[PDB]
Paper text:
Here, a microfluidic device is described that enables the production of crystals by counter-diffusion and their direct on-chip analysis by serial crystallography at room temperature. Furthermore, the crystal structures of four proteins and an RNA were determined based on serial data collected on four synchrotron beamlines, demonstrating the general applicability of this multipurpose chip concept.
Author numbering: 1 to 52, 52A, 53 to 82, 82A, 82B, 82C, 83 to 100, 100A, ...
The structure:
């Protein structure tokens, strides 16, 4: 079956940087758009960033585009999210997802279990 596994979460302090990764198996990795979503306490699940199989990057808002960077390594079936200047508001569970057509919609076909990021001040 298809399997997406996130890692790299933990407890950081405000202003820190953090790199999350996502490893995929059971699909032909280079034919899928890959996306990061998050769910903060008291909020709905929301789009963070996406990188399509042709390499175009799409970001959620101005709150994200300046601080976060997304990339993929097709040779290793892995994608990464680099997060800089983290704030308490970024505390959330971060999910990796894959889909053959979608970009910003939360209705992607495949989902990982998520990794938890806590940011304290």
């Amino acid at each position: 079956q298809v399997q997406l596994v996130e890692s790299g979460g933990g407890l950081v302090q405000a202003g820190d940087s953090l790199r999350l990764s996502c490893a995929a198996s059971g699909l032909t990795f280079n034919r899928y758009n890959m996306g990061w979503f998050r769910q903060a306490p008291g909020r709905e699940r929301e789009f963070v960033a996406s990188i399509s199989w042709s390499g175009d990057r799409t970001y959620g808002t101005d709150s994200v585009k300046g601080r976060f960077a997304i990339s993929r390594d097709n040779a290793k079936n892995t994608m990464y999210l680099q997060m800089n200047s983290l704030k308490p508001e970024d505390t959330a569970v971060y999910y990796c997802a894959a889909d053959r057509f979608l970009t910003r919609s939360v209705k992607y076909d495949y989902w990982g279990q998520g990794t938890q990021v806590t940011v304290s001040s």
